[PDB]
Amino acid sequence: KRQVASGRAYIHASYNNTIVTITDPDGNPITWSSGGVIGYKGSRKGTPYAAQLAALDAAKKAMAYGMQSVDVIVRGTGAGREQAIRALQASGLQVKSIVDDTPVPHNGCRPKKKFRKAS
Amino acid sequence: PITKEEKQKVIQEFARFPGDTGSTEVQVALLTLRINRLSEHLKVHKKDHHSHRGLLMMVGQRRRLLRYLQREDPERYRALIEKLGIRG
Amino acid sequence: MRRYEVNIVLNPNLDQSQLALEKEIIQRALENYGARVEKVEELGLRRLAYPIAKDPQGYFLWYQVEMPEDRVNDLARELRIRDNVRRVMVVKSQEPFLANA
Amino acid sequence: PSRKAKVKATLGEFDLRDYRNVEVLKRFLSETGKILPRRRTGLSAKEQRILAKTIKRARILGLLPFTEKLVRK
RNA sequence: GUGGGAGAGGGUGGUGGAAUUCCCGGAGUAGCGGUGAAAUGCGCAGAUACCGGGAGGAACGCCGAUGGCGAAGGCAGCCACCUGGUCCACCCGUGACGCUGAGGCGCGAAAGCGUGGGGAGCAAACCGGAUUAGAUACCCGGGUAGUCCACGCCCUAAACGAUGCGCGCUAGGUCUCUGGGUCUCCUGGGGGCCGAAGCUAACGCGUUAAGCGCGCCGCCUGGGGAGUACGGCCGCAAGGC
Ligand SMILES: NC[C@@H]1O[C@H](O[C@H]2[C@@H](O)[C@H](O[C@@H]3[C@@H](O)[C@H](N)C[C@H](N)[C@H]3O[C@H]3O[C@H](CO)[C@@H](O)[C@H](O)[C@H]3N)O[C@@H]2CO)[C@H](N)[C@@H](O)[C@@H]1O
Ligand SMILES: NC[C@@H]1O[C@H](O[C@H]2[C@@H](O)[C@H](O[C@@H]3[C@@H](O)[C@H](N)C[C@H](N)[C@H]3O[C@H]3O[C@H](CO)[C@@H](O)[C@H](O)[C@H]3N)O[C@@H]2CO)[C@H](N)[C@@H](O)[C@@H]1O
Ligand SMILES: [K+]
Ligand SMILES: [K+]
Ligand SMILES: [K+]
Ligand SMILES: [K+]
Ligand SMILES: [K+]
Ligand SMILES: [K+]
Ligand SMILES: [Mg+2]
Ligand SMILES: [Mg+2]
Ligand SMILES: [Mg+2]
Ligand SMILES: [Mg+2]
Ligand SMILES: [Mg+2]
Ligand SMILES: [Mg+2]
Ligand SMILES: [Mg+2]
Ligand SMILES: [Mg+2]
Ligand SMILES: [Mg+2]
Ligand SMILES: [Mg+2]
Ligand SMILES: [Mg+2]
Ligand SMILES: [Mg+2]
Ligand SMILES: [Mg+2]
Ligand SMILES: [Mg+2]
Ligand SMILES: [Mg+2]
Ligand SMILES: [Mg+2]
Ligand SMILES: [Mg+2]
Ligand SMILES: [Mg+2]
Ligand SMILES: [Mg+2]
Ligand SMILES: [Mg+2]
Ligand SMILES: [Mg+2]
Ligand SMILES: [Mg+2]
Ligand SMILES: [Mg+2]
Ligand SMILES: [Mg+2]
Ligand SMILES: [Mg+2]
Ligand SMILES: [Mg+2]
Ligand SMILES: [Mg+2]
Ligand SMILES: [Mg+2]
Ligand SMILES: [Mg+2]
Ligand SMILES: [Mg+2]
Ligand SMILES: [Mg+2]
Ligand SMILES: [Mg+2]
Ligand SMILES: [Mg+2]
Ligand SMILES: [Mg+2]
Ligand SMILES: [Mg+2]
Ligand SMILES: [Mg+2]
Ligand SMILES: [Mg+2]
Ligand SMILES: [Mg+2]
Ligand SMILES: [Mg+2]
Ligand SMILES: [Mg+2]
Ligand SMILES: [Mg+2]
Ligand SMILES: [Mg+2]
Ligand SMILES: [Mg+2]
Ligand SMILES: [Mg+2]
Ligand SMILES: [Mg+2]
Ligand SMILES: [Mg+2]
Ligand SMILES: [Mg+2]
Ligand SMILES: [Mg+2]
Ligand SMILES: [Mg+2]
Ligand SMILES: [Mg+2]
Ligand SMILES: [Mg+2]
Ligand SMILES: [Mg+2]
Ligand SMILES: [Mg+2]
């Protein structure tokens, strides 16, 4: 119980899971959700539908804190990123803006063999 | 590095006559300058090989010029060596 | 003797006293290392593109000098000692290369 | 094909080697902090090559960004 | 020689931001991760996701290319110092001083060795989870040497253009890097493509020759046995010639 009413929405999307963290404008989190929070267990967490459910859960949880406008921040390239976006777009939350913050190294660290043939 | 003034100094020093930039003596002189400078560079920085190749090439060129002089005019050869102080 | 350009970025929060002291130390250290100052541009505070030392802005000094090459590096060291100096970049001066002329 | 505009043609007389001039150099950076390609800058090999170094200099001096956040999407 | 030019050519010192991991603080809750699907693993001693601060190690995103440099190996954030090669213009100087080069000497990716340091990420061996008929593998979670620095060894390779070096001659067209000029164009050096003559078993090469010629070096002589055995030299060893 805070009554923030305006804040940020972080979408962390990977080919495995999608997970959403809604925070106050300082960056400190309020609530969060993910494909695991909904009943989905295995690979189904990577599903766009799982992402939709996740974003919606996070939004509805943040409604209870009485939040209205959000700033969307997107990270990672994964299935069901845009679906999470569209989910938050009309959740009843006003989406003020969207930004892709995905971290790209300037080539610091040798990737796992999985991600190699790159740096 | 090597400034124009030093270069002109050694040229006019070893020039066989006024206006001579190209004589064997002048060439050997200039090369000796570059060689000594590079060796003093390579006492420190002794892990720099790419330059050491250049040193090798310069030494070679000098030895060929000196050889030529020695063949044509042994007097000028001796004089040049004594003036430079080569041969160790 | 070569012609360089010293860039110095210091704390924007400095009151005129501390600032004057810093510029004083810059002059001092400069003369100590034998650099003649051809000209100077004080650009004051400007808005950095990224936070430096947690501060969103910075104060800019630019000196076009002429100094013995051998000690240039040795100069920068000294200039970086002061806490209030958050950036030092020394650059060999170059004739301007104009585009779209 | 980048038929919108070239950064060189959209600009006047200026010095490529001046790292302190932001209001020009900024035009050579993308929506993100990235240096633009020859397609966008309309420069030449030599020109672009000098632009790169001066831009990097400006970056270190704190005048230009290394990176930025992508708006919209 | 004088005057100019371009470059990730080399060595030393300093320095910049992005990211990964770890630590500290805030906020926050039931999972995160991973896969074809999973499980091991991590998480209620509060992880994942988010903000802030700090430590350290390694590599330099965009520029960036079909680009540039180097004899080869190879070279990429930025700054300064030291230093090698090279190209053009002038037509100034010496006067055949040239080319090649057995042996010698130096350089020589990665892996590997010795001593000391360092250790973030990655990762032989190894410990587990899967898959499978089995799986001493591919996939997943960990992880030591090592990868990094200094000093000294090692001397190998699909060390490749699978094309030794130098010089002369033999249509052009086109793209490009880099100089000069009376700057549509001409001229010089370098990197590509298509092609005259010619060559080639063919594929293809074709002023960057695999064409026409001269000089000098290295090498080949059916396949397996075999880059083995013996001897010698080199090496701390692995092993090399
Ligand atoms: N070499 C390092 C680099 O040099 C760049 O610039 C280099 C080149 O552009 C410049 O060229 C010089 C110049 O005097 C002019 N263009 C002609 C001259 N022959 C060249 O000098 C050349 O020959 C001499 C030996 O005589 C070498 O010592 C030197 O390394 C070499 N560049 O000399 C500089 C040093 O070699 C930039 N400073 C930077 O990229 C970096 O420091
Ligand atoms: N750091 C600049 C470079 O340093 C080289 O040598 C330096 C580095 O290779 C070496 O590593 C140092 C290390 O001593 C010190 N204890 C920690 C420091 N972070 C390291 O410095 C470097 O480490 C690696 C490259 O090795 C880089 O990724 C990193 O950005 C850089 N900081 O330390 C040397 C100096 O003590 C060469 N001089 C040349 O490449 C260049 O000047
Ligand atoms: K290339
Ligand atoms: K071993
Ligand atoms: K021109
Ligand atoms: K044919
Ligand atoms: K072909
Ligand atoms: K050999
Ligand atoms: Mg999953
Ligand atoms: Mg030769
Ligand atoms: Mg300081
Ligand atoms: Mg270099
Ligand atoms: Mg270097
Ligand atoms: Mg960091
Ligand atoms: Mg914590
Ligand atoms: Mg784990
Ligand atoms: Mg673990
Ligand atoms: Mg437990
Ligand atoms: Mg457990
Ligand atoms: Mg509990
Ligand atoms: Mg604990
Ligand atoms: Mg436990
Ligand atoms: Mg974490
Ligand atoms: Mg942090
Ligand atoms: Mg540590
Ligand atoms: Mg690239
Ligand atoms: Mg003449
Ligand atoms: Mg004559
Ligand atoms: Mg030879
Ligand atoms: Mg030999
Ligand atoms: Mg080796
Ligand atoms: Mg090694
Ligand atoms: Mg070792
Ligand atoms: Mg050790
Ligand atoms: Mg690992
Ligand atoms: Mg593994
Ligand atoms: Mg196993
Ligand atoms: Mg089977
Ligand atoms: Mg060991
Ligand atoms: Mg090849
Ligand atoms: Mg070829
Ligand atoms: Mg080639
Ligand atoms: Mg050839
Ligand atoms: Mg040969
Ligand atoms: Mg030759
Ligand atoms: Mg050509
Ligand atoms: Mg090339
Ligand atoms: Mg052809
Ligand atoms: Mg024919
Ligand atoms: Mg044919
Ligand atoms: Mg070749
Ligand atoms: Mg030929
Ligand atoms: Mg043989
Ligand atoms: Mg052979
Ligand atoms: Mg036989
Ligand atoms: Mg055999
Ligand atoms: Mg063998
Ligand atoms: Mg025998
Ligand atoms: Mg034997
Ligand atoms: Mg022995
Ligand atoms: Mg063995």
Nucleotide nearest to C71 (CA to C1'): E81
Q: Which residue type is seen at C47?
A: R
Quick check: C67 and C2 in contact, CB under 8 A?
Answer: yes
Q: What are phi and psi of A12, to 5 degrees?
A: -100, 110
CA of B60 to the centre of ligand 2 (A): 36
Place of tokens 């950064």: D7
The residues near C74 (Cβ < 8 Å, ≥ 6 apart) are C33
Q: What is the CA radius of gyration of chain B?
A: 14
What residue in D sits closest to C94 (Cα-Cα)? D17
Quick check: C63 and C6 in contact, CB under 8 A?
Answer: yes
Strand, coil or helix: C61? strand
User: Which strands, in side-by-side order, build the sheet including A29-34?
Assistant: A29-34, A18-23, A6-13, A69-75, A94-100
Place of tokens 């390609």: D37
CATH number of D1-73: 4.10.640.10
Query: What would the 3-class secondary structure string for C16-51 be?
Result: HHHHHHHHHHHHHHHHHCCCEEEEEEEEEEEEEEEE
Q: How many domains does chain C have?
A: 1
Task: Look up the CATH superfamily of A1-119.
Answer: Ribosomal protein S11/S14 (3.30.420.80)
What does the domain layout of chain D look like in residue ranges?
1-73
Give the CA count within 13 Å in the CB-facing half-sphere of A53.
15
Place of tokens 């990176």: D67
> Could you say which nucleotides of strand E lie within 7 A of any protein CB atom?
1-3, 6-20, 26-39, 48-54, 57-65, 67, 70-73, 77-85, 92-94, 96-98, 106-108, 120-123, 139-141, 151-152, 176-179
What residue in C sits closest to D9 (Cα-Cα)? C100
Cα gap D69→D73, rounded to integer Å: 11
- Give the resolution in Å: 3.3
Quick check: D73 and A74 in contact, CB under 8 A?
Answer: yes
Helix (H) or strand (E) holding B10: helix B4-14
DSSP state of A10: E
Cα gap A83→D9, rounded to integer Å: 41
**What does the block give as tokens for A68?**
């209205």
Cα gap A119→A106, rounded to integer Å: 9
Angle between helices B24-43 and B4-14 (to 10 degrees): 140
Cα gap D54→D62, rounded to integer Å: 13
Cα gap D4→D18, rounded to integer Å: 26
Q: Is D27 exposed, middle or buried (0-12, 13-18, 19+ CB in 10 A)?
A: middle
Task: Look up the CATH superfamily of B1-88.
Answer: S15/NS1, RNA-binding (1.10.287.10)
| Max Cα distance, chain D (Å) | 35
DSSP state of D8: T
Size of chain C, expressed as the number of residues it contains: 101
**What does the block give as tokens for C91?**
């650059």
DSSP state of D34: P
Cα gap A78→A16, rounded to integer Å: 8
Quick check: A74 and D69 in contact, CB under 8 A?
Answer: no
CATH number of the domain enclosing C32? 3.30.70.60
Strand blocks (E) in A24-77: 29-34, 69-75
Q: Which residue type is seen at C95?
A: E
Where in the sequence is the domain holding C60, given as residue range(s)?
1-101
Q: Name the nearest CA neighbour of B58 among B26, B36, B77.
A: B36
